[PDB]
Amino acid sequence: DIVMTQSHKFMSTSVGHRVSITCKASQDVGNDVAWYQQKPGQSPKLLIYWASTRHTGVPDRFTGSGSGTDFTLTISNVQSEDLADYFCQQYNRYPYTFGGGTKLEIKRADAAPTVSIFPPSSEQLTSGGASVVCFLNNFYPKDINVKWKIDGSERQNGVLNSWTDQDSKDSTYSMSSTLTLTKDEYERHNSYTCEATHKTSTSPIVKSFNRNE
Amino acid sequence: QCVNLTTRTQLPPAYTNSFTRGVYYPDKVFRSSVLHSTQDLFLPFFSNVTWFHAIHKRFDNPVLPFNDGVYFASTEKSNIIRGWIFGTTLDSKTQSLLIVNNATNVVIKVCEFQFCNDPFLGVYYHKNNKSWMESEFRVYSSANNCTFEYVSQPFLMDLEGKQGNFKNLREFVFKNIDGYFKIYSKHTPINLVRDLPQGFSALEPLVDLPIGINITRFQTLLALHRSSSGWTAGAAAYYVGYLQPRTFLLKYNENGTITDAVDCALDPLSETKCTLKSFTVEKGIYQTSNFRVQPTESIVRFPNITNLCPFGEVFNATRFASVYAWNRKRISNCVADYSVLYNSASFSTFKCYGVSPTKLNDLCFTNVYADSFVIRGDEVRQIAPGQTGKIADYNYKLPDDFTGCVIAWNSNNLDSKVGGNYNYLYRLFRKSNLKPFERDISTEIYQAGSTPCNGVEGFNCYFPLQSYGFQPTNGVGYQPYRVVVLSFELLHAPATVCGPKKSTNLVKNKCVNFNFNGLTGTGVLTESNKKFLPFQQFGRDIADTTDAVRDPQTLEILDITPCSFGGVSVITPGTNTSNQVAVLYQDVNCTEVNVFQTRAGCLIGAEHVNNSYECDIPIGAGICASYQT
Amino acid sequence: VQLQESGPSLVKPSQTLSLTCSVTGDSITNGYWNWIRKFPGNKLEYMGYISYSGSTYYSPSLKSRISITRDTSKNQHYLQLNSVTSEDTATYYCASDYHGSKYYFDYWGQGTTLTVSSAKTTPPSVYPLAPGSAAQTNSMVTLGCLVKGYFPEPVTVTWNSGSLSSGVHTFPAVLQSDLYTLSSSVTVPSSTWPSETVTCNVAHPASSTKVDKKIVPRDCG
């Protein structure tokens, strides 16, 4: 098989800049090197076939050239509707071994985050579950740390983060965490606190609540 | 540890020209009234050093390399310079030498110290009862794996800030040769304001530290004095130079003090002193060095090719074989160009396993095999190690260590016709699988049941070699594709498939390196007037000197001219008369290097005067030089 | 050509996988139908293919652990795997190798995420989220939609039957020990809560379960 290997993990350009995504595979990539287009919230679609021709509905700015195994998807004057994950492959012979991937995003202005912690509802304690939900949305860029404070002490085990794609209207991000507890551990602690350290704030926003209500 | 000083301002890397600084004693050998030659890491004269300060606007202490050899020079008035950090990676992972002075002892420890982000020393509370006593030690944090420790004699160093100008000068040499570290100390009173002293002195050794470790970088520590991040500094400066392995001359007097120093690679005036091995140079012309032009690059001057592997009768053939009766063709004793196969822009499938086709072009092989068979579009993808089906299991099996290439393109316009192309066959049934590189051309009737077939068709007796079907009204995936499988192996036979060709352009009047089919070396290609024979390749002079060549692919005779060489002459005056010198090369013009062309060479530094005077210093071929007003 | 996958998304070990890739818009005249395994974390791997006449050929990745059939009457094709292990927790996509009108097309469907475990089908328990009396308020009010105890993957969380799209940030699933936890948010000003009522709708394609729960400020002081 053809071992595909990509170097750039993410590309952040602006309107009018050049997007350079390399595909330095360990084996031969061939002449029929193609590129996908993973639209946000939709299925990935084909963009370039036979390394010179575009798909139906594609402008003339999405071209491609190179020599040998060092190919680069030449993108000039990238607009705001071009945020897609690009993969490099070959359409010569089955099977089609793919690469890692490179996320393309646009560069916009910063935004102040907003911390909002939620108390657990009464319907969760009836079954036997207990979980504290705290969100952190409308922030830029994604370089942020979301941690918990269980009675002042931090917690790392059982904390899993998740994120979405860049919004097409506000150009912000969204990233929170998830922490679930048992029934016996819910009655032992008193208050929970979540925060976020952003580059546009000298002090993090402290938001907490009380379980007694 | 983590709190850094916020009083640091970015300074551009300016330079400072020294006059004669950087001369020490290379060993403990005494001489008298001579000029001993030696080769060691010395500081060249008129060089550029760093431009740093130790004041309260500029407070910078960067990290400089150490493997090239460095020189230390710093003025001092209130003992701001305290110690240094000598570490390989400046971390606790490797060992590091620490030489610091806390005004009581010279702490010399070789451990794996935990260096902070910005270590510094200073005295707190300068408003009342200062006493210049050291009360802060934030150099390292821990110590582990120590190999050497030295404690000096107890003393008391004063850090009193005397006003006025500078009064002390301390210059050290920081170098490490074969693990033996040397410290060359010098203390002398001076009178400065800002700049470095443009004088001359010597540096005497103080101690000897056989650390036996490799040092790659270093860092100079500074002191802080203010009446924990906004602490200001005093008023000092430090310059860091770069040593180079050059040759110096030392004039020892009766007491041992170095008085003069000659740099053999600074100016052509001092180049005569190193050859003659004398300070007092008489009036005349002497030879100092040898001029030589280094070659630029090596260009293989092969316009096109000569021999060729038979790829025309394999790729552009009209009729191929079947998938069960494929013909193996051995390709050897020829030069193959694999670069034109990838950039042909006519192959719909081109994949190599194990190595890239752009990488095997600069590599010699010994056995190249090529196959050719026409199959349907659903069977081209089965030519791979580990495949199943009818082609991979019953017709053609590839081994797991396949280091070849797969070539396939579209041939629907030639291998198909209206009505059905029933030419090619394929085996459909077999009792077992095939071995790698095994050909099965048997036409035996497959016995599917228990009853024998007796060579005829009947119950559970079908013909294995079934005919293909090719129609132009089919889809894209049913078009006939000509599949070419290239095999590459390695044996004890010598390599016959080679030919890495790199040609750029026609280069003239340049010292380049030529590479021909039977001649190589360094020469200058120029025009000629001879008429070479069509079978001859090159020509030689009387004393076995090759000076002419002919291009095997272009009818043009190019003479192999040797590059620009010759002795280096210089006109030097007396030591108490003047210092102006002129550059005189041998047997070259003034274009391949106050410009005057002579018969012996190019004379740089003299003015053409039509007035004929008395010959004082000869030049050559009726030309002399003298000194006029 | 419109593609839509359908079938059960819960297969125990040592069982049989069965699903159907539906084709709508173009008949089965030209083009192939392949399968690509999607690893979690934007990683893909080829699985196999089939023709459109009857020539069933297999891939070297699955020699005898794959079974793909064809159906030219209903214009569909099935997918069946043998000896399903715990490493088959992934998503399979079906695409067309179509090349017509001098252009090369490649359409992809939605996909059904397959999860191989020992647990049975568990319906999702949508729980509302609202700030209490002891929570620190702000100018921007956030409303949540908690789903705890759902199995298996995938899921879809919408807002107001898919009509509300401003401020919707549907976070994907996580990789916990036994059960997963969803988390959805919305952006509403201070005049909305608690004056207006916002209701999140959570779908489940693996079991056709749609739970509608309203967000109420419970419990308060």
Residue numbers in the entry:
A (entry chain H): 1 to 213
B (entry chain E): 14 to 69, 77 to 247, 255 to 620, 641 to 676
C (entry chain D): 2 to 222
Original paper wording:
Spike (S) protein protrudes from the surface of the spherical virions and mediates virus entry into host cells. It consists of an ectodomain comprised of the S1 receptor-binding subunit and the S2 membrane fusion subunit, a transmembrane domain, and a short intracellular tail. The CTD directly engages the cellular receptor, human angiotensin-converting enzyme 2 (ACE2), and functions as the receptor-binding domain (RBD). Moreover, we captured an ensemble of cryo-EM structures of SARS-CoV-2 S trimer in complex with the Fab of 2H2 or 3C1 up to 3.8 Å resolution, revealing the MAb-triggered stepwise allosteric rearrangements of the S trimer to coordinate the binding of neutralizing antibodies targeting the SARS-CoV-2 RBD, also providing structural basis for MAbs 2H2 and 3C1 as noncompeting antibody cocktail.
To disclose the molecular basis of 3C1-mediated neutralization of SARS-CoV-2, we determined four cryo-EM structures of SARS-CoV-2 S trimer in complex with the 3C1 Fab at distinct conformational states, including S-3C1-F1 (with one Fab), S-3C1-F2 (with two Fabs), and S-3C1-F3a/S-3C1-F3b (with three Fabs). Among these structures, S-3C1-F3b was better resolved to 4.3 Å resolution, and the other three were at 5.6–7.5 Å resolution range. In the S-3C1-F3b structure, all the three RBDs are in the up conformation and each of them associates with a 3C1 Fab. Indeed, all the three up RBDs in this structure exhibit an additional outward tilt relative to the up RBD in the open state S trimer likely induced by 3C1 binding, with RBD-1 outward tilt the most (50.8°). Due to the all up configuration of the RBDs and their outward tilt, the originally covered S2 subunits are now exposed when visualized from the top (indicated with red circle), which might be beneficial for the release of S1 subunits and the subsequent transformations of the S trimer from the prefusion state to postfusion state. Unlike 2H2 bound on the top of RBD stretching out of the S trimer, 3C1 Fab is attached to the side of RBD. Inspection of the better resolved S-3C1-F3b structure revealed that the epitope involves mainly the β2-strand (T376 to C379) and loop in the core region of RBD, and a small portion of RBM loop. As for the 3C1 Fab, all the three CDR loops of its light chain and also the heavy chain CDR1 and CDR2 loops contribute to the interaction. Specifically, 3C1 heavy chain shares a small overlapping epitope on the RBM loop region (including V503, G504, and Y505) with ACE2; additionally, the framework of 3C1-VH would clash with ACE2, which could be enhanced by the presence of an N-linked glycan at site N322 of ACE2.
